[PDB]
Amino acid sequence: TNQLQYLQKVVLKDLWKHSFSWPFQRPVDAVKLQLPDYYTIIKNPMDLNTIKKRLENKYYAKASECIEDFNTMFSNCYLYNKPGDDIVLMAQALEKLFMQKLSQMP
């Protein structure tokens, strides 16, 4: 709960306010984006609002488990999309920021 609080107040907050965060703020809306294959290819969907709601309602038992959700979020993007896709560049940049902030965790 020392570190979970970091991930809430610092990591999540900074990722959320970064301008690349917007595709990752809600779950993928497959109807609106017309991706009928998405939730078949991506079996463990994850997004920043889920991670937040999960912190807010104390779903996590350990910092490690919150970190793995962030990583699933990014790996989901890489699996569904292609190298050189705009969405993949955004995700890689958010991932860099993410590591940057992990380095400075308590």
Ligand SMILES: Cc1sc2c(c1C)C(c1ccc(Cl)cc1)=N[C@@H](CC(=O)OC(C)(C)C)c1[nH]nc(C)[n+]1-2
């Ligand atoms: C709201 C969301 S959620 C999202 C995207 C959007 C737009 C984007 C996207 C975001 C930003 C830019 Cl510049 C380009 C695409 N892409 C899709 C995959 C796709 O192909 O969607 C289109 C068919 C392109 C809509 C995708 N995969 N994983 C995620 C989280 N997203």
